[PDB]
Write a protein that binds this ligand. Sequence first.
Ligand SMILES: O=C(O)c1ccc2nc(-c3cc(Cl)cc(Cl)c3)oc2c1
Ligand SMILES: O=C(O)c1ccc2nc(-c3cc(Cl)cc(Cl)c3)oc2c1
Lengths: 116, 116, 116, 116
Amino acid sequence: CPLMVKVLDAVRGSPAINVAVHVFRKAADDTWEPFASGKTSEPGELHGLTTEEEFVEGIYKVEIDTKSYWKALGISPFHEHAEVVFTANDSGPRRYTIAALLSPYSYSTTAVVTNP
Amino acid sequence: CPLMVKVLDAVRGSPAINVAVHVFRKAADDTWEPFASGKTSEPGELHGLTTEEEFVEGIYKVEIDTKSYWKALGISPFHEHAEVVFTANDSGPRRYTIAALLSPYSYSTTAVVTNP
Amino acid sequence: CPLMVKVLDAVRGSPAINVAVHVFRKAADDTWEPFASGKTSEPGELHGLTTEEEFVEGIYKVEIDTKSYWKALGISPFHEHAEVVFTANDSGPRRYTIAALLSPYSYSTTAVVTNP
Amino acid sequence: CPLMVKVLDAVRGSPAINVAVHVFRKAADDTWEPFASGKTSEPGELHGLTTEEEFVEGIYKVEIDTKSYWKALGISPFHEHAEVVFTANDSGPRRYTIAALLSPYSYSTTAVVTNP
Ligand SMILES: O=C(O)c1ccc2nc(-c3cc(Cl)cc(Cl)c3)oc2c1
Ligand SMILES: O=C(O)c1ccc2nc(-c3cc(Cl)cc(Cl)c3)oc2c1
């Protein structure tokens, strides 16, 4: 999979299930174009977002709807969403895991980038 | 100072100095209006962004130009920038510290919301 | 696997390979007894540390030798090691993933706990 | 103040107040000698732990009693405590801030090492 998202919950010590994720690609007119979307499944993972052929060089945005997640557990969170923005495949194709660790008033995000 | 920003470097164990920060407010029309900007000082802080009068309830975005910071150090970074999007709510007096901890392929952010 | 360790590198955006990990269990005389050890493999994972039958209730310590890792890349890190200490299986058997994200002057750790 | 400790709560977006901290120094004989302790104050800080005279090169351990902090809030935590182990080196004047960000199943820590 060229693009995978992994979300974890720091409060419950569990994968973050049913979290909505939207991915955008920057178009030539500098607007964000919709690229792919999905919801995390039971291990907190979102697979199947794109293919190698479609995932060309560009600037991508991964938006994680953290607010809906915390609201469904009763918590009013601080952030509206978590956004990760990066250039992808500018030196050739890579495989990208975007991971996020979520708390109500905090989040962390890292990237694991591997060369197939 | 209802709004302060603090930026730390996880690679060198130092405040992140000379980091550009821009702050935006969501307009009645769905777009981001420039609200305030600055560069972090020696203790990695940015003060004096707004006043109690102007800092009304709303949705705000803090953008931190992480990519120029790592490029200045000779380290190749993943993210184009770090963004923090949140709602500011009147519900007591409230001062906001937005803190960010930076690594080349990872960042963390938290909010410290106190009341004087 | 009842106990799995996952280590990531925040500087290179890669799994942390060949990291030594030592696991201890608190004995009845309040000393730390050696329980298991290993080195992370290519995806940054350490499997095979114990079995369900051997992994009884108790207090466990997972020590990750972060210093040797950073020294082998040329960096003098801040921490001597990263230690995670927790009670395990006190409500029945669980499966535990201990994850760590490493920078030279920082680290993060979380736990994912699942009920088989 | 060559040594300061700061503790933040990621669940409530607040300084972590009344957290017990103990500091240890590694003795010529491989054991941890008590060096200093205290409880965090309102801004989540612990000051006045040592002096420039006493704070000699060595290996130090900072232990943060996270488990009592979460139990006070009615939240079931994973870790028994958070420990930070590091070497203090004479190589310039150096003041150490040890910062920790706390969630029930996760914590992060960083060091801010500056020079006056
Ligand atoms: O690729 C996977 O399977 C995978 C697994 C566990 C993982 N744990 C982390 C993780 C840990 C901390 Cl403390 C902070 C953040 Cl942002 C991430 O990312 C993971 C990725
Ligand atoms: O030295 C201070 O005064 C001071 C202030 C705010 C601070 N916020 C951080 C912080 C942020 C994140 Cl996301 C993760 C971690 Cl571990 C730490 O450390 C601080 C230190």
